[model samples]
Target: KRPNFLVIVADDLGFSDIGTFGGEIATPNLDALAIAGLRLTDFHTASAASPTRSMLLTGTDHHIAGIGTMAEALGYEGHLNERVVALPELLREAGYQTLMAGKWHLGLKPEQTPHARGFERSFALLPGAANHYGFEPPYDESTPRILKGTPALYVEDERYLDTLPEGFYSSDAFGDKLLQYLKERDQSRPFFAYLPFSAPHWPLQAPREIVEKYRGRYDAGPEALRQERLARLKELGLVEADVEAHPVLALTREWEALEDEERAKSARAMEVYAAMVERMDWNIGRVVDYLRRQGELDNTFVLFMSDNGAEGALLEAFPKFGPDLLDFLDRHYDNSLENIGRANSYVWYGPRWAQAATAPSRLYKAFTTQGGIRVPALVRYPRLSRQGAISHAFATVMDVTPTLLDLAGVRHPGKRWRGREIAEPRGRSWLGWLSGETEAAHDENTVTGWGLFGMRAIRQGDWKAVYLPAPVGPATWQLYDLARDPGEIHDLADSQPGKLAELIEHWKRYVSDTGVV
Candidate 1:
């Protein structure tokens, strides 16, 4: 009998945030899984949250999965195309009971909800973000923020809802909800549980004790912390010693340039962020414990990954969401330095924190650089190899669905599905590598590509080329030998124009082949 699948995803998490990935964050639970499974050294995702998720669930390109760019789309339309088949839909067909708890950022319409998508039971974070406390102002809004354009129609599981329950905290509540679903699940079939946490994303909030655990931990600031993390990563053999730590973004202010008051506030902001991550890990521990008590750990295949890289946009400067949100924050809430990570506050760590969190990797979320796409990834199926082994083979978010299907002996429908011709997935499963069936997941000729918000990237073997309009980089493409420059600090365009041209041609074909307009 095949093992059950449990896919745990974290939002806006850093590649190096967990202990196994070489960071100070206490993730013993995640570390235990890595020690007992295989760590992916070159795993990648789309540069943003929703697109990566779309690819992750469909085994199809995000463009083909109805989210060509974000939550809107038909190659160019602004939402998931109707013809796409979700992974849960496929699994339900394969005799697996699908269950989801947490962020379903792929779609915002009633037709796109998890129940509509095939999950038998679900408790989702219907929006990209929400108040962790599930409290007074926001969650109390008459209209569920999860709705796309419709405000009056508040819904959860499409059920009408007006306010969060008492004692609500997102990570804790999400973990509890999955357990609740499991407690009442169909016991006859294997289950697929997807837990995508929105914790540690922004407006970072956690239990007071958890927050106090690292109150002054990040006083070291970005540069010092980045250096320490990079060194530790090399020591752990997770990072090559030769990989240069790219300089911080131009938007980052020098740590020394800050006044004492500003520095203390910055440190507190990080402290709250760290606690949120640990709180997420703590919630993950609760789920793992539940699985253990059910005597299901050994028979379960567990996977963990982040949707994209850390968010580099600071709240004070970039003011995410929009003017309406900024106004709402100020009008209805408090953002004093002491209140930064509380539910009363909506804070973002900015570029300095992103630089530290995604140490050694250049740039951060929303760009096609390594820092935006390359992230911490883990696979634990002792059914394959359960030691401290790490796979350095290249992989991507799109590969997750196919890998899960492959492990369960389920076949992809075809090049076509439901009477519509589907774009063949650009991802190949990693089961072959994990099961000792192949030396690598992607070969020299295997094509992998990415395009989101005008940023573009493609990787085949060690060569990778990225293009982002302005601030990120030049409009034209810059190439790198990922084998040597995974951080993308060095450009091979001038040194090897022939190879650069070859890569550019390959990228153009990928854009056209993947239906990128």
Candidate 2:
């Protein structure tokens, strides 16, 4: 029998959100999976969501796919270069049933939809982001309606939220649909399920009951939370003692600096954040239970990861800007409980809390810091992976497609589809690592870039070098021995200028070859 594959991706999840990763978040399902699989401690991804998704799907660097930056709604220029073969396409050829549910932020145009991109079945929010209600009108603006793909008509119980409320939680809804698909799937054939949840990202919406559970939990504030998480991370062997914690943002006010009322409000805000994550974990558990019921749990290969770190930037109303920005922000962020029945509104969690989410790591999403790239990655395939093992080998988002293909005994389709040549897959397989083999698959000095985020990073063995671009700072390059400074606080760049120069040259070569510069 072919091994079943389930890849679960969460959006804007922090590195320490899962129980095994050093946070108080109750992710028992994931923690149990970790016990039954191999944990990759040094995995990384692109600076943001779409870039990582583009890499995972096409098995090429994001830059090569022409998805170097998030696309605008008008021009909508960021579709995957059709020439590159996507993982789903390859899986379909290999006779695996492919299904995708949840956020498909890579593109929204008809030509760039998931169905056109090789997914046999998909239920997705085509745009970069959306309001949780699913009430927002269609993008065409001609007729306002929600989109349901393929098998055509299906009743969307609009009042389903009245029973469970919480404004149609997408995480829960996506998981429910995935279970339904699994139940109806052909048992004789192996299946590949790609679940990319749009939760714990923005709008900070969650069931009031779930949100209340985290009330006062964060009263100790961001610094205390950071210190506590760091301590727990060290105890869990996820970090070293020498890892220097990055300093807090200069503009951020201390917990004590706020008035009692302000602190209470801030605490409530964090509760909502925690609730969002807790809800995600609950849905994940549902998927896990389904796998167990199907008797496919032991033989299946499961990989779980996040698109990026905690998002710190807020999405506010750009009223001064043109209609494009105004309409986009207004439709997405303006609504609230007061206007929930009337209009849809949206807003981001903002930067201060985002820094708290990525405790100990510097910067938030869209930065070259560890907070943006370093993600929580867990791989579980009982038949293939060594149970309870941990591998600190460096891995990137691009590696996932190749890794999944390797597990399925499929080869990369080296053919072009559109106008672009299918670039050779950049990631090395982690199959060997799963078998208790410590042999490094890729070169120690593997280089990676993030052009849209205005930063670049390179990892050579245990050492990592990062260069944050101008307009953001002094443009100084920093270096850290990840083995010794996983927190990346100590800057070895000034002392070891020669090492920094060498990595800079190496990164330049990578950028030139990958066409990211």
Candidate 3:
């Protein structure tokens, strides 16, 4: 019999925000899973939501899968394109019951929904981020548009929900819907369940009690927290003790420079974020407990990962959302200290706090740097030996579908899917590595490409080449040896000119192949 699969994704979760990854937050559920599974510390993803998800489900590069950029660029189709088949589609065809709940940021139209994508049963939020409580506030208001003409769309099966069920907190609701589907799924076949929770993403709302648990936790500030987490990571053997962490980027003000009021609000914002993560963790425990109670835990393959790195960009200032967002937030919401974590407040902790979570890396989300793309991942399966092993081998989000398909013994139709010519996935399956047949998940010479919002990067083994515009990085290409300088602090473009040019050639090849516009 084939094993059931449970894939859980956390939205905008930082590399070290969970207890398993040296975070101070209480994430007992994730920690337990990591301790009993293989932790892939070198896993990478696209720096944002839909792009990573496009690669995640399709096993293809985001460019070929349709999201070339977060917003519409020439190569961005804004949804999953027809060039590749989604993972669940193939699984469903192979007699697996495909079930999904939570964020479905790929598309908004009926034809682009999860039900259309291949999940036999699905409850999904059709957009990126939303109010955790529900869409009653800005969605109800006839005046200002919170989502910029798009409502917080949710779907169950094939039906678009006009209104969410009462008390629809994002994490709790997603878990509940997934659990319900599991309870009622066809008993004759194995299941592939996807729970992509949009917790700790934005509008960081949580039950007040959970928020209270970490009230004064971050008062010491982001740099202090970064130092503490770095120490913890060294103790856990996740990072080398002498590693030179990248200095805090000069984008945000230092803690000592901020007014007392500003500092208080910043600390509270993190408290809310922590609460959201803990809440999501607790919800994960619920599903795992349900699987265990049904005696299916041992027979299940469980995978947990974040979609991308931590979010540090100020939401109001993000140009993609539109010019009206800041005004809408100010007028329609209350970001005051008392109201920040409640249902009516819209607030985000900026780069300073974000850097704490992304310590030892360059910058935060929306970049191709390690801080933006590198993430925490865990794999637990019945056949995977050497339990609780920590693997530093390079892996990627695109590798997920191929790995799952390999485990299920399902073959993808190489050229054509339903009569349309499809692109072959560049992703490699991890079966050989997981089964102890190989030392590395990917070849050291294999080149990987990443470009979103004009920041581009190419990684070939330990050598990496990056390009950033203006203040963040020099307009020209810079080189780094990631193995020695994981923080990406040292630029070796001048010292290693030959290696730099070699990687540039690979980057150009990637651009031509992937159709990077």
TM-scores for all candidates: the values are 0.94, 0.87, 0.97
User: What is candidate 3's lDDT per residue for 233-338, written digit by digit as tens?
Assistant: 8888888889999888856679999999999998999999999999999999999999999989888999999998898887666555555677777787888898
Instruction: At residue 174, give the lDDT of candidate 2.
Output: 84
lDDT of 1 by residue, 84-192 (tens): 6777888898899888888777666678778888888888766676667864564444322322221222235666467667777889888898888888877767899
Give the C-alpha miss distance for residue 160 in model 2, angstroms. Answer: 20
Two-way TM-score contest, 2 vs 3, winner = 3
Whole-model Cα lDDT of every candidate shown, in order: 0.79, 0.72, 0.87
Against the true structure, whose TM-score is highest? 3
lDDT of 1 at 343: 71
The alpha-carbon RMSD values of the candidates against the true structure, listed in the order shown, are: 2.9, 5.1, 1.7
TM-score pick, better of 1 and 3: 3
Show model 1 residue runs off by greater than 4 Å: 72-74, 136-156, 316-321, 324-328
Per residue, candidate 2 scores C-alpha lDDT tens digits across 354-461 of: 776576678878888888888888888877636686667778888878878888889886665445567778787877766657555566656655555567787777
Winning candidate number (lDDT): 3
